[PDB]
Design a protein around this ligand. Structure first.
Ligand SMILES: [Cl-]
Ligand SMILES: [Cl-]
Ligand SMILES: [Cl-]
Ligand code: NA
Lengths: 16, 16, 16, 16, 16, 16
């Protein structure tokens, strides 16, 4: 899957 | 405006 | 030293 | 409504 | 001084 | 065990 950072504030990491 | 990440700790997003 | 972001969740900054 | 703190980690506030 | 928690979201501590 | 909040900043929960 893809590694991403996004804004939720804090910058959060996710793997979708 | 410009999209930026900066350190505040957590990494924070801002649009200046 | 090196500037890095890592995942701890939130994205955190460190200088090692 | 009710004022509450809960654990999400960090302690988060909510008003339900 | 006084110890307090407040909402900034996360619950944050301060001493005023 | 005991439920506690402490300051780490954010207020964090722990069970010791
Ligand atoms: Cl927010
Ligand atoms: Cl800090
Ligand atoms: Cl977590
Ligand atoms: Na946080």
């Amino acid at each position: 899957a893809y590694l991403l950072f996004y804004v939720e504030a804090k910058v959060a990491a996710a793997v979708k």
